[PDB]
Amino acid sequence: PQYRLDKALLDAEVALMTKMGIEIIYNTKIGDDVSLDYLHDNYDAVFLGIGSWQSQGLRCKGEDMEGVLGGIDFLREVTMNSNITLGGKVLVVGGGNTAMDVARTSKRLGAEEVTII
Amino acid sequence: PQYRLDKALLDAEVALMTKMGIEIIYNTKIGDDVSLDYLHDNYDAVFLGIGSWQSQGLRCKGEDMEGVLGGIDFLREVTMNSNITLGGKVLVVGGGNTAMDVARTSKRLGAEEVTII
Numbered sequence: 001p002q003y004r005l006d007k008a009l010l011d012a013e014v015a016l017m018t019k020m021g022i023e024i025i026y027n028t029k030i031g032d033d034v035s036l037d038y039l040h041d042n043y044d045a046v047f048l049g050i051g052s053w054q055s056q057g058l059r060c061k062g063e064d065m066e067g068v069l070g071g072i073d074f075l076r077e078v079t080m081n082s083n084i085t086l087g088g089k090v091l092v093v094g095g096g097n098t099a100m101d102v103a104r105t106s107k108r109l110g111a112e113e114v115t116i117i
Numbered sequence: 118p119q120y121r122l123d124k125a126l127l128d129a130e131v132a133l134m135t136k137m138g139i140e141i142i143y144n145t146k147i148g149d150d151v152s153l154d155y156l157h158d159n160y161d162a163v164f165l166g167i168g169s170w171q172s173q174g175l176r177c178k179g180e181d182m183e184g185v186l187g188g189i190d191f192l193r194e195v196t197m198n199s200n201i202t203l204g205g206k207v208l209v210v211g212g213g214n215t216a217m218d219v220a221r222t223s224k225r226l227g228a229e230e231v232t233i234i
């Protein structure tokens with residue numbers, strides 16, 4: 001979240017790094033926009049740092065109903081200044097750092113009462 | 118074929134054109150390496166000049182047997198200085214300009230007798 005890490009610091013550091021001669025191409029998803037065979041043919045080496053960008057579901061009955069959303073997706077829409085819906089009462093399921101970030105961002109986003117399960 | 122069009126002329130003209138500020142990216146097949154949705158998102162317009170790059174088959178019995186090859190593929194392997202096999206006797210089926218180019222390139226490539234059907 002923004003209150004813990006300022007994005008201006010991150011942007012300034014990446015600008016410092018790209019001054020060194022590293023080219024960053026945004027909005028390019030490998031396998032969906034550009035093949036991996038293309039990168040394999042055109043480059044002397046390939047490194048995959050894709051990360052873990054899926055959210056585990058509730059693993060319960062009715063987990064597919066409307067009104068249930070993952071924590072990672074929620075934080076991504078918060079970051080991109082998109083249009084979200086929260087409501088007065090929000091229940092966050094989990095106990096790691098994702099749950100803490102979701103709960104505190106929800107408290108900042110006008111949720112009147114937030115409870116962690 | 119090279120004896121009718123010199124490739125040095127074509128290369129010099131394309132160099133003249135690319136001096137004007139046009140970037141040409143080689144070895145990039147759209148739909149196989151780069152998606153068309155990528156170009157649709159990243160560019161203000163897209164023009165498709167892909168051409169007709171398939172050869173019609175013989176439409177006869179045994180057309181899939183080894184030893185039968187298309188004219189376009191044959192001319193492409195001649196151009197790329199690849200390793201081909203012809204033999205003493207070659208039969209070219211067709212009557213257009215593709216047949217003429219194939220027959221004359223075959224006469225230059227050591228075929229002792231070439232016949233056009």
Ligand SMILES: NC(=O)C1=CN([C@@H]2O[C@H](COP(=O)(O)OP(=O)(O)OC[C@H]3O[C@@H](n4cnc5c(N)ncnc54)[C@H](OP(=O)(O)O)[C@@H]3O)[C@@H](O)[C@H]2O)C=CC1
Pocket residue numbers: 058059094095096097098099
């Ligand atoms: N990379 C990071 O920053 C770290 C991740 N986290 C937390 O862990 C998550 C992912 O890492 P990892 O620890 O491997 O993930 P886990 O699969 O271990 O899940 C982590 C959290 O969810 C609980 N949990 C998992 N499955 C269920 C289920 N069916 N029902 C109820 N609770 C469940 C765990 O509690 P329990 O203690 O009982 O296992 C814990 O609170 C993050 O989303 C975050 O919440 C926390 C610290 C470091």
Ligand SMILES: NC(=O)C1=CN([C@@H]2O[C@H](COP(=O)(O)OP(=O)(O)OC[C@H]3O[C@@H](n4cnc5c(N)ncnc54)[C@H](OP(=O)(O)O)[C@@H]3O)[C@@H](O)[C@H]2O)C=CC1
Pocket residue numbers: 175176211212213214215216
């Ligand atoms: N772009 C170019 O440069 C032009 C193309 N060509 C010729 O035409 C071809 C492609 O253009 P297009 O004319 O539309 O192609 P076509 O499908 O009309 O075929 C052209 C040639 O093949 C003959 N042919 C077609 N199908 C069969 C079959 N089953 N059996 C035997 N002969 C057949 C035609 O003779 P028929 O006279 O009886 O139709 C003609 O010689 C080229 O490969 C080339 O050979 C020639 C001039 C211009």
